[PDB]
């Protein structure tokens, strides 16, 4: 069963966007110092998630 590569391109351009939004949701882990003035929660917005 093959092939029609417009399958494969849109198989990518969401997986990468999953990686970037992974790097905005999970963005607030690596900062991460004292006070802690931890100004953003590493697993924060369950509504917006």
């Amino acid at each position: 069963f093959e092939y029609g590569v417009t399958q494969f391109p849109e198989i990518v351009t969401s997986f990468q966007e999953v990686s970037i939004k992974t790097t905005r949701d999970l963005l607030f882990a690596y900062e991460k110092l004292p006070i802690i003035n931890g100004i953003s929660v590493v697993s924060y917005p369950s509504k917006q998630l």
Binding site: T22, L26, A29, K32, L33, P34, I35, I36
Partner: protein, 103 residues
């Protein structure tokens, strides 16, 4: 103490397999981050006066910490597609933290 029980936490689970005990991943690496930011936190209480003491304590504690995290970070950076969600620092960025721990 941080380096001590860090490499001891390498030692006690040096027996078996790769960390399917991911409580050991987040044990060593999370609690390493815990005690690390405790130490950076209580480093902030004191502000040095000799520049050569800044160089001294700086390069001393750099030479204390680093190779553990080099062989150990680099040993155990092969456990997830996002180790990010378990392991936080590079040696690059941790080095940078130490280099602006000493303003």
């Amino acid at each position: 103490d941080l380096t001590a029980n860090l490499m001891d936490s390498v030692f006690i689970d040096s027996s078996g397999k790769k960390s399917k005990d991911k409580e050991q991943i987040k044990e060593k690496f999370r609690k390493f981050n815990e005690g690390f930011e405790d130490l950076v936190s209580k480093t902030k209480q004191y502000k040095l006066s000799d520049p050569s003491l800044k160089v001294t304590l700086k390069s001393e504690i750099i030479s204390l910490v680093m190779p553990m995290y080099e062989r150990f970070y680099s040993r155990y950076k092969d456990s997830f597609k996002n180790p990010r969600k378990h392991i936080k620092y590079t040696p690059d960025e941790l080095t940078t933290v130490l280099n602006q721990l000493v303003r």
